[PDB]
Amino acid sequence: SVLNTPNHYKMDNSGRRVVIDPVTRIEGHMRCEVNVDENNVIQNAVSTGTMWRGLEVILRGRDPRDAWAFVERICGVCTGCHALASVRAVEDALDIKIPHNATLIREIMAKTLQIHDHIVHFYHLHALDWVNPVNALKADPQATSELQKLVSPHHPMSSPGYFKDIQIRIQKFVDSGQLGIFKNGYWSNPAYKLSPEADLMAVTHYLEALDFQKEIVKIHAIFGGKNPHPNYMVGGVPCAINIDGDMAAGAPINMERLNFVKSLIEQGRTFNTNVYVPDVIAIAAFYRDWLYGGGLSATNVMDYGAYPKTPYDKSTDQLPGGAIINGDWGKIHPVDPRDPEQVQEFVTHSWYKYPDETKGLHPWDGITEPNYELGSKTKGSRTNIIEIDESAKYSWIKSPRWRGHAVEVGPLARYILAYAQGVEYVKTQVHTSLNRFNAVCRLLDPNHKDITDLKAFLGSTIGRTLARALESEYCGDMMLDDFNQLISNIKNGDSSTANTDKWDPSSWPEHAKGVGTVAAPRGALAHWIVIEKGKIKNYQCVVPTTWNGSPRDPKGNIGAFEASLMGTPMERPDEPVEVLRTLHSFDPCLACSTH
Amino acid sequence: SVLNTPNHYKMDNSGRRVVIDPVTRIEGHMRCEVNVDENNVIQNAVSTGTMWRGLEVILRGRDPRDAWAFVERICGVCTGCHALASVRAVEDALDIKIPHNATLIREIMAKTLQIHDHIVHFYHLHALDWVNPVNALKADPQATSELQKLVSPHHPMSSPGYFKDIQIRIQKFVDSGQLGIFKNGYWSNPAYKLSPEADLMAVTHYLEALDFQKEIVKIHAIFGGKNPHPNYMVGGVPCAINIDGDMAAGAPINMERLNFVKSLIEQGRTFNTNVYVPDVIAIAAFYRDWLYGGGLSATNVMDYGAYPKTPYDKSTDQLPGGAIINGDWGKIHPVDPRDPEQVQEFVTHSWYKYPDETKGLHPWDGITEPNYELGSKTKGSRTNIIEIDESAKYSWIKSPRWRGHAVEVGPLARYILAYAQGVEYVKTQVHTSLNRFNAVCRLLDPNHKDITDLKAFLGSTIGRTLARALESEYCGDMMLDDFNQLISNIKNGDSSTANTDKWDPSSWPEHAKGVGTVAAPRGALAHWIVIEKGKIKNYQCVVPTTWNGSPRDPKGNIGAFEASLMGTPMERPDEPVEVLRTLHSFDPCLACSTH
Amino acid sequence: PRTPVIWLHGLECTCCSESFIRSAHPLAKDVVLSMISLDYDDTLMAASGHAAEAILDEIKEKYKGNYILAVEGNPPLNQDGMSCIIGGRPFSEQLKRMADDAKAIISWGSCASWGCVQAAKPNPTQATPVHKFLGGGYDKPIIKVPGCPPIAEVMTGVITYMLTFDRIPELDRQGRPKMFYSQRIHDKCYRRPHFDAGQFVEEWDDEGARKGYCLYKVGCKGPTTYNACSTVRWNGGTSFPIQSGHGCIGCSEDGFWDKGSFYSRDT
Amino acid sequence: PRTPVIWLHGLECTCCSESFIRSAHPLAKDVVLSMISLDYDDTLMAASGHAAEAILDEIKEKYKGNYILAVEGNPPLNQDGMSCIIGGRPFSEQLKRMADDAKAIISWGSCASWGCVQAAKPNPTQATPVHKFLGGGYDKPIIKVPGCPPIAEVMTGVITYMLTFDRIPELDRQGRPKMFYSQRIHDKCYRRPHFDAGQFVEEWDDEGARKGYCLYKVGCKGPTTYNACSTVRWNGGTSFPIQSGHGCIGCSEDGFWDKGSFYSRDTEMNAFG
Ligand code: SF4
Ligand code: SF4
Ligand code: F3S
Ligand code: F3S
Ligand SMILES: [C-]#N
Ligand SMILES: [C-]#N
Ligand SMILES: [C-]#N
């Protein structure tokens, strides 16, 4: 069949079908199927979420004050963001305002998560779509040092002998014949474009990032007890502050703990600027001629907006939200998560049931009733899917739409929205990164012509990857600002951390509804709660990867993942490096997507 | 006067007198006076220990089981070595044998101390005698990087931009006008011979070592609770082991704690090999023409011997002891700390009294009765010493002698003793170090003629400094061996850590005496205890700096410090860089010396 | 040769993999490069699709009876198992196949040990812990290492024990290593002096909260929860829930999601 | 400009300087380069002899009333003070002169706070803590930061507090910052559940030792000792004495060396005694 979607794609499944199940180097479980034409260009793509747990069902009847801990376990990668969304949703329902230190500590935890999550995504899940560790073994260590000095002159770790030592360790591993996580990788595919030296630099940095990442999450351990899965609470934060009073050493937050947080913040900022951001720029330059994967990013993007410099004043959001539609960056449509005409979820192509499956349901009206049922065109059986039938229900992921539009969410969405709204920090990052990109390009090709077209540059899998790194850097700077504000608050007399006026359910209205939003690492997150007589009557989550990984809607619009693969050529369709490189650029969180 | 000492020095105090009080960048308090001839050569040297506390007096009447904690507070720099000596002395007196794992853990703690102490001494105490941080501000960062890569090819930290960043930090500090610990340094004295690039490398490493040193002592925290001043006990170690039994997580030593010790050991080995040892070799090569300071190291050296591969078998000491006398490296005289004709302390030139001051007292017979009294030729007054009278009592340090001989103690003494006794690890270290030294020399002087004379090489202030660094490296390898032995013991069923058969004083003889020896960081340490009816009747310490810093004896022999300075030319007698450089090479511990 | 480990993922949040890589000692890089051979692991592995599947086939035959099967998450039994699909088939079939030729199983976390969040009422997918899915007749050790997630150094401490000492650690009656799970939080809790004195947090951010008083009256489940949080602590010994001011929620114990409100007192 | 600090050293073992440089956060490097101006400090300073003394003179003038005087160790009064000689004169004279124009004093460790080991019976040097040496009439704050040595992050935590919040921390009656010294070890000890159950180490390396039972019966002084060891802990939160199996010896408390044998059992344990 050849389907002409209202969002302007032609999904053609007559060519050769290629199945990727499992999709690895994601959180959770995904299947992807594509069809390629005679020229090995993707002409159909199918996103299937292959897990479901049912947290929305499990929450019914429970106490709103407990909900955060349940929903935190939607995801251990984006750990905490669902807790934040939950406590915000309850606070919204119950009209609880929290103390400024609680706002600040929650933002510090959120930015810690952003940094941790982005760094681990890029190195440990994405990089092997761009980096060939076997090829690293061919690198000249001196030339690797020269590259390193160009890529990031301030990073201290550049000795030829260091790169040689890393290479010796890799070589020993390969020589052992126990190739582990590298086993059967697609390393002979010409899709890999780094030089040996860049491959060695990037493997070196993979290991540096693995060592570093455990440090930054100590901020979560200080404020929230543990990482993964730090604690939150409705009305404040549990980490009470006592800097110089009786028994201060035994309070959660004291002078020593604050000094520790300062140290950890600075370490993160340094890794962002000296290791992560320079690497993404440099790798992008090696891949300067591979500008595939933009998908919807050029046309339709959305975020709820986050990080208001003034608590509770969204016009002060440092990552302002809204929706850009049909590629008009000059028009920011306001996004209201309360409006039943805006966010809606369809299940026409998902493994759920609605009474009227023609409807898209706003999440205060949402329904989660499982319906695992395969289309009569499936190749295979119910417990052995050979080729899924995307004409019918084909995913555990619901289909969210915004005013009927399919949109992309994530750091790239936020970066476009911020650029378009005049956020100068973001504009500077973009322009300086474009310039740095073109400088590396020129180093690689003195015949290079610079890239000036921001839409082409950002609206690509490379650009999606770059926006994530830039966002990490911005989050470190913001988190230092938050820390300094926390110290200022304390200095001026305010050590308060919780509002308990509405802790007791006897203070609650018999009926209430609320929504909490978060700029989660992968995009726009919100939780919608309906409370009745002290209990959860409905709890619906719509998560970033639900938006990006969405199956088709009743009108046939495709979602961000499917759109991003359309038109991409594959060197070797049976070695689908290009598909993995673009899907991974969305940082798919499949446990999130389905919850 | 001109005094012709029996150990062949001519002490001539007719030239100009130079006073250094305080001697800084030592532990504790010292005064040094010298006389220089018309050529600015030192022809007299006077070592004065300027503090006393009286630990030997304070211990009287107390319980032997408590002694370790009192004497540990002799010194916070060589923290724990006195505790080790004390428990050993008590165990000797009471005929206590401790479990193998206690032996091992005590040796692990001892080698941790060696590494920590040696590294902090070289960088934070000694280096400013060789390194000019103001001149570092003149360095070219790229040429600093080239030097670094030659000095230590494996160390990762060599980026030009890193050295430039360090240089910018030091420039900001200097430009502040608050020069702090660098204020009033003798930075224009031509005695400083590094290039700007070597100065910048060394300052960089000073900072790296300040960051590193706090890590290795976490081994003391794990086995001993804290650093400084970890805990010990008579009969074993308190850090009970439980790897996989009930409540293991709550035992002092469990699997996670062992894993932590492993990690710490390896970090220390790496820093020794990649930072500390290469720096001492390289600095030595810049100072290849400055071979002063050998003193007694050319003739008379001693250590009690340490680190037996077979517990309680000293023929297996990995740093074997003895005494070399009159420069005959072919004759190792056995040292017995029990023999009253061997170790003796005189007080003729010290601020103490004996009933018969002609006597040297073996420490089981020792007496510590203060007698602050200045000679009638003193310039100044009792509370304002302008020039001390070294013909009379001039120090809080007693005068220890071995069979009437003045000897040098310390890492250099141990290295000469080990070399001479065929310890292949040491012979290899010495030969490889000589080879590396000559290679760095030829880098600096392409017409360099190799040094081949080991006596001349080792027998100098440079050699003393090198031996300390080599010892650090050896201690790291030995500690790894010890850890692996501990693991093997546990694996084979032995998790035991204490012997309590003689814990109760009722099990003790009415009268007992013991001696405990240690290879302390600075040399030969021993404690001698006499027990009577449960209580300390006498407790006498003779510590490494007591030997090295000794004042003259009744026959006029000079000690190691005074000897080391004789014959040294000074560029600027009133900016006495050379005196500090040589005294600091002994790593004087003045609180230890006087206790 | 390094011990082969196959790390399977069922219904999960991936918090157990994430915790593992936090290990301070040994470092995850060193575990993977030098201690074990991590032969299959969805989260970090290069291979996907058919190429991934082929490793399982190869490791199974090649190292039959000689690999450790580590399991994160759990198998669902509802939806014909297709609430967790891997390679077009139920995860339960993958788990069974690999379990059949494992030397031993490690059940990471509360998901694989007990069921965790997806098994909380009404358990829509009939998510089932590994030992119950394999049943009583399973003849190889199942090491339960519970917690949501477990402490990083507990995870790597179990592995280093096995590798260093060449045996399964001693287990309690619930299959948990006595190395880490043989005391309750409350049996080693530094706020116990306050519990003993009747000194409690009564309301968030009260005087007691600011002094570090006991969290019993705000719902701490430490009295009934076996784990190493109060001894080893979290994230390189930085903190644990109670240190940072929130009671234990019981996250290493079977059924903790359905024990009542986290803020209701332990009984 | 950075707060001037003069760090003097009396009779001492140097454990307090050593502890200070162990600080995990802030790092010692950063304290010295960026937070304070460490203008005099025997252990680390470039200058010696007459050039060192001249720094005293200058700072004292230039920053009169504006430097913090930190003191490690203590002055002896016996031997005409010449059991601790600095520049040929008694250390007590140095201490007095610099105290006269300090803004505030930090008494580091048990030596400066209380007397520590050299003041244990029979105190041959008449070693005297700073506050007693300067007497009742001294009109500037003396912040006691006791322990042998204090915890590193406590030492740097006091300094960062003062620099960040622009005030002396609140002190208890003994002059110790409530930040760190306002609980006993035993008020926050993770072995307390065992104490409460009567589960003790009775002999070294017994069953209880291997399970982490309470150390009371082997002499732990945690019931009478005020410090942050059971909360902040030591060496970047790695351990503390009790965790590693030896009781507290009381090392932050006045007179701990003469309180009794370290293996004697602690007193005042019953509310009916
Ligand atoms: S109830 Fe919780 S906070 Fe209180 S002592 Fe027990 S484990 Fe600690
Ligand atoms: S006596 Fe010591 S070990 Fe026992 S609970 Fe008190 S402080 Fe802890
Ligand atoms: S909630 Fe879990 S992490 Fe530990 S403190 Fe309680 S068992
Ligand atoms: S001996 Fe000192 S270090 Fe702490 S635990 Fe006791 S106050
Ligand atoms: C999810 N981010
Ligand atoms: C998350 N997505
Ligand atoms: C001391 N050595």
Ligand SMILES: [C-]#N
């Ligand atoms: C120590 N001498």
Ligand SMILES: [Fe+2]
């Ligand atoms: Fe997510």
Ligand SMILES: [Fe+2]
């Ligand atoms: Fe010493």
Ligand SMILES: [Mg+2]
């Ligand atoms: Mg949902």
Ligand SMILES: [Mg+2]
């Ligand atoms: Mg003596």
Ligand code: NI
């Ligand atoms: Ni997620």
Ligand code: NI
């Ligand atoms: Ni010493």
Ligand SMILES: [O]
């Ligand atoms: O997720």
Ligand SMILES: [O]
């Ligand atoms: O010392």
